[PDB]
Design a protein around this ligand. Structure first.
Ligand SMILES: C=C1/C(=C\C=C2/CCC[C@@]3(C)[C@H]2CC[C@@H]3[C@]2(C)C[C@H](CC(C)(C)O)CO2)C[C@@H](O)[C@H](C)[C@@H]1O
Length: 255
């Protein structure tokens, strides 16, 4: 019974714009990573919280990585059809509230189920759960984060669907502090309708089965991950001298 209306001219343009935006802001060779402060991995087979906090050995590198990624996400967002129709104030609210979520989403591209790592090149830029603990985070974030990465991987999203999901994540009307919720909702609805239409006419079975609902659930998962990251960042920031291991951008977004 289900009808399959064709993608409109505008919806095709929206998809093209978002793919272009992503290609301009996501380097799939990770060739800039050598510019970050170097990764350091202390001997911590026992997973000692005291040692992890004393050294924070992976923090400078991972802070630089996240800071770089926030810059790329700002660039991506500015290319989302309609985003620049929002007031500057709403733009900043949306960016600061979604940054960590979009980072988790976009990182799925480097994540591999081969060995459950984010593989961004050689030994040095292969990131494991043990690197996250070396940046001062705990299992309560790490466990659901890995589960999220695998769940997302198993959806086998088209790149078209991946970029739409990132856009929908950013343009969310229910974020605290937004002023024009109605306009944000209108922009999101345009993107949501594009995604729904794409899945129903371009995604082959059986991977398309209830796919939109699964993608919506992943957005809810990201909210939970956002909250847990914020909680853990707060405690991490109590460590004397932590600020110098971060960046001004990271300090603003998460502080
Ligand atoms: C950040 C990106 C990449 C990997 C992402 C990773 C791999 C390393 C660990 C990351 C950055 C995790 C996402 C969240 C996770 C995190 C929980 C975020 C946390 C950041 C701090 C500031 C310490 O709280 C440290 O670990 C690599 C690549 O896919 C992109 C550049 C992408 O934007």
């Amino acid at each position: 019974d289900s009808l399959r209306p064709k993608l409109s001219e505008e919806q095709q343009r929206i998809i093209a714009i978002l793919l272009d935006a992503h290609h301009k802001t996501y380097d799939p060779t990770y060739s800039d990573f050598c510019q970050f402060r170097p990764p350091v991995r202390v001997n911590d087979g026992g997973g000692s919280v005291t040692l992890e906090l004393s050294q924070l050995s992976m923090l400078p590198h991972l802070a630089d990585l996240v800071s770089y990624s926030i810059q790329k996400v700002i660039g991506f967002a500015k290319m989302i059809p309609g985003f620049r129709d929002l007031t500057s104030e709403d733009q900043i609210v949306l960016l600061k509230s979604s940054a960590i979520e979009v980072i988790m989403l976009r990182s799925n591209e480097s994540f591999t189920m081969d060995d459950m790592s984010w593989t961004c090149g050689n030994q040095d830029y292969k990131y494991r759960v043990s690197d996250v603990t070396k940046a001062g985070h705990s299992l309560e974030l790490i466990e659901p984060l890995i589960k999220f990465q695998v769940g997302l991987k198993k959806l086998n999203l088209h790149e078209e669907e991946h970029v739409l999901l990132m856009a929908i994540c950013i343009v969310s009307p229910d974020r605290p502090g937004v002023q024009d919720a109605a306009l944000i909702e209108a922009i999101q609805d345009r993107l949501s309708n594009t995604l729904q239409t794409y899945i129903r006419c371009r995604h082959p079975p059986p991977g398309s089965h209830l796919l939109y609902a699964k993608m919506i659930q992943k957005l809810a998962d990201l909210r939970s991950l956002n909250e847990e990251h914020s909680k853990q960042y707060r405690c991490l920031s109590f460590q004397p001298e932590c600020s110098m291991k971060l960046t001004p951008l990271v300090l603003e977004v998460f502080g």
